[PDB]
């Protein structure tokens, strides 16, 4: 506990702007970087990252260079923030640390950036908790940091990374998820690399800003819609980029956060369409739904009429007739003529029960037919068809399990004995 | 109950299954439970392939399905235990389903006769089959599940939530059958009757995802499905269920309002919700704002909560006097965690002193700016001023506080062109100086302006 | 504000339903054996059954029984 | 069905549509499906749908007690003057009284 209270007690020492914090706070932090508790190491990493947004602080960091590679990707990105200045970029170059990282970014970690950022956002505003307002910041990405010192331009163009992402953005597939995924990754990479005065020069030649504008207002996937607004707000961090955007009717904020009351006579990334509903155009799609006996009920009643066997029965769609081909079952037997009319009566009644306008009366009718002739309910052809109707009607639950249980205790000698015969 | 495990698998299983069918006679049911358990063991330990199995799969499945006719429920449970172990490749399942075993599983699903160890097996069998192949899912099981998921809540069945879990899981692979049997409306109605947070948001995410892919977009209608969730506010008399107990009515209304509010704040998070709900046509978001200017005493105190926790603002305590409510939401308000024992300094120092970043983006403000502009487009301030003017004080204070907070956000995260004319406050100011209107509106608008200044 | 690919949606559904249910029935059904892409002895799944039985009535019957005796 | 498809024009009708329109349109789908192919199997669904709608609606009719014009139909309260005489009171020999 004293570990943790003392160590997180340094935010006040940072956020209150104490005299010459760089002299001793950073050395104490680096000493605590080695301690036993992983949680305390993580929070120390967090506070050090919060501190390193001051250039003098970062320089006084680069007076002593420790090894962060024994920690997680958090320390990885923390060390990647070193690339902001050639004074230190030269130190880092000596063992080829650049090409050993950059390729692995291009191949694997660029896709991880979008995953981790959407992770942070979902934790922020979706109540996910992967096992009051938060503050979501963009993690430090290599491609953004290289472009800072005007020579990473060469160090990047040696591979011609621009061409693959750009012809990706001109001709996207937009069918399934990995195209979407790497397309988002490319978008975020572009937004990052557009974040300097110099990078603007190396991106303006392809004239892809019109491509992103086209995507932001005529594309399909709404997640890509949101990502377009995000990246376009990103490329609005510099004055020259804001000048570029204003040509295409997109407003942006032209002041920094240093004073919360700025007068309009380096900024925060932000871009909006001038008339917000412009991006709200969606093309609609047409809906996909584009594609005898009961008349006898008047005069012909139960009492006087009682003194294939089905209308909608075929060689298919019977629980016994289907097996007859595949297993060579015996043909269905013909027993006692007086029943068929009853069969169609009960099926008409249950079809009437489908309306459920007066369920109880039809329920009583089938119940009467039931106990009057309790043994009639052994036919399989009727059973398969009522199963089919339950697969093709809309029934309230009570009538549904009622009609199911009305065939609860039945025997079916014919299938079972024929099957044990044909088994062996 | 005969463990050998060292013999000819063909003869072993053949005599096992023959004695299991037993001509349906002369064999006890508990020893049938035995035979089934031994059967399951034999498939567990023996590699399953016809050549060394010595049999086709058709005779095997036909023999298994006869176990579903006897009276013993646990026999059906063991039959399910076996059947899940049979499904191994799509060919196997399609040969199984061409046989009308679907209707049998269907009977087994809907019995609810105090037998809660069987249908669980049936449901997990269904999950196995949908994982291996949902593209060949049967319709009968679909209809059974939709039936239990539609009106299972009134009969207090304890498997409805598991059921909607299943239908949502299957919805990803084959929306054709779900739509044809009309499931999406069932799901949607099921988002209003679940007060728990996480389940509600997870459910709504399904249909929100369904609005992305053009294939998916073809499956859903235009203006009847999603904007349904905002029903209990757009209606003055919403009746969600036909057969309800008279003994409680209002508590129904509070439950419905909580569910609908949480659903609303859920849908405004995803891009699909935002784009769909603000179409240039007569979309529902215009309807919400239009409702706001009707004098109904509780509706106007229903919407303000939604507005606050959309913008993730701190609610004020209900009060008839402005200045108390002002202090109630001061950011410098004390927090319980700031006591000695809890968070003595560091947590409090997190809140009070400002962040050290000077140029980092903070996308959260970007999202809030987008939503704010979306509301500004549809004349939200007009309705706000309407409520501030013509209503009760309990509600006037709430609306005034919201207006002040939104304006303070405006000149802080909003680009100049969209923020250079809003702060002029045309409509309120115009009413403030009319000398022909009844004086009540005039003086209360004046006081409202005074409160706004002190707020700033 | 990014929930598009099926993986995260499925994980969110499963976690939300298992953790927040009053009755364990659902999470008893929500086991994740189902695989996807060790089904060793029953994925150490192992039970059998366990009881006491014979046969009572139905929901109806009383209905059918009582009406049959009164009609006789 | 003919009248609803021209679109709701006010908030009350819009809310009614918002609540019931899916059902009311798909029942029409089923009845057209029936009249295409005579088979009572189709109209059973449509009738069940209609009757469910009836049970839903019938539960609230008694509560209907008052109407606010601004919610019911917006055109009327924006008159504030007109040319019509009060309906039913008009004689050839007396100056008219306008609404």
From Swiss-Prot, chain B:
It comes from the Eukaryota. Phosphorylated by MTOR; when part of mTORC2. Ubiquitinated by the SCF(FBXW7) complex, leading to its degradation by the proteasome. Deubiquitinated by USP9X; deubiquitination stabilizes RICTOR and enhances its binding to MTOR, thus promoting mTORC2 complex assembly. It is found in: Cell membrane; Endoplasmic reticulum membrane; Lysosome membrane. Signal peptide: none annotated. Coiled coil: none annotated. There is a cross-link at residue 250 (Glycyl lysine isopeptide (Lys-Gly) (interchain with G-Cter in ubiquitin)). The modification Phosphoserine is found at residues 11, 241. Component of the mechanistic target of rapamycin complex 2 (mTORC2), which transduces signals from growth factors to pathways involved in proliferation, cytoskeletal organization, lipogenesis and anabolic output. In response to growth factors, mTORC2 phosphorylates and activates AGC protein kinase family members, including AKT (AKT1, AKT2 and AKT3), PKC (PRKCA, PRKCB and PRKCE) and SGK1. In contrast to mTORC1, mTORC2 is nutrient-insensitive. Within the mTORC2 complex, RICTOR probably acts as a molecular adapter. RICTOR is responsible for the FKBP12-rapamycin-insensitivity of mTORC2. Belongs to the RICTOR family. Component of the mechanistic target of rapamycin complex 2 (mTORC2), consisting in two heterotretramers composed of MTOR, MLST8, RICTOR and MAPKAP1/SIN1. The mTORC2 core complex associates with PRR5/PROTOR1 and/or PRR5L/PROTOR2. Contrary to mTORC1, mTORC2 does not bind to and is not sensitive to FKBP12-rapamycin. Binds directly to MTOR and PRR5 within the TORC2 complex; interaction with MTOR is enhanced by deubiquitination of RICTOR by USP9X. Interaction with MAPKAP1 is not enhanced by RICTOR deubiquitination by USP9X. Interacts with CCDC28B. Interacts with NBN. Interacts with SIK3. This is Rapamycin-insensitive companion of mTOR. It comes from Homo sapiens (Human).
From Swiss-Prot, chain C:
Ubiquitously expressed, with highest levels in heart and skeletal muscle. The modification Phosphothreonine is found at residue 60. Coiled coil: none annotated. It comes from the Eukaryota. The modification N-acetylalanine is found at residue 1. It is found in: Cell membrane; Endoplasmic reticulum membrane; Early endosome membrane; Late endosome membrane. Phosphorylated at Thr-60 by AKT1 or RPS6KB1 in the presence of growth factors; the effect of this phosphorylation is however unclear. According to two studies, phosphorylation at Thr-60 by AKT1 is part of a positive feedback loop that increases mTORC2 activation. Component of the mechanistic target of rapamycin complex 2 (mTORC2), which transduces signals from growth factors to pathways involved in proliferation, cytoskeletal organization, lipogenesis and anabolic output. In response to growth factors, mTORC2 phosphorylates and activates AGC protein kinase family members, including AKT (AKT1, AKT2 and AKT3), PKC (PRKCA, PRKCB and PRKCE) and SGK1. In contrast to mTORC1, mTORC2 is nutrient-insensitive. Belongs to the SIN1 family. The CRIM domain forms a ubiquitin-like fold with a characteristic acidic loop, which recognizes and binds AGC protein kinase family members substrates. Component of the mechanistic target of rapamycin complex 2 (mTORC2), consisting in two heterotretramers composed of MTOR, MLST8, RICTOR and MAPKAP1/SIN1. The mTORC2 core complex associates with PRR5/PROTOR1 and/or PRR5L/PROTOR2. Contrary to mTORC1, mTORC2 does not bind to and is not sensitive to FKBP12-rapamycin. Interacts with MAP3K2. Interacts with ATF2. Interacts with MAPK8. Interacts with GTP-bound HRAS and KRAS; inhibiting their activity. Interacts with IFNAR2. This is Target of rapamycin complex 2 subunit MAPKAP1. It comes from Homo sapiens (Human).
Swiss-Prot record, chain D:
Serine/threonine protein kinase which is a central regulator of cellular metabolism, growth and survival in response to hormones, growth factors, nutrients, energy and stress signals. MTOR directly or indirectly regulates the phosphorylation of at least 800 proteins. Functions as part of 2 structurally and functionally distinct signaling complexes mTORC1 and mTORC2 (mTOR complex 1 and 2). The kinase domain (PI3K/PI4K) is intrinsically active but has a highly restricted catalytic center. Residues 1-90 are annotated as: Sufficient for interaction with the FKBP1A/rapamycin complex. Part of the mechanistic target of rapamycin complex 1 (mTORC1) which contains MTOR, MLST8 and RPTOR. The mTORC1 complex is a 1 Md obligate dimer of two stoichiometric heterotetramers with overall dimensions of 290 A x 210 A x 135 A. It has a rhomboid shape and a central cavity, the dimeric interfaces are formed by interlocking interactions between the two MTOR and the two RPTOR subunits. It is found in: Lysosome membrane; Endoplasmic reticulum membrane; Golgi apparatus membrane; Cell membrane. This is Serine/threonine-protein kinase mTOR. The gene is MTOR. Coiled coil: none annotated. It comes from Homo sapiens (Human). The lineage of its organism: Eukaryota, Metazoa, Chordata, Craniata, Vertebrata.
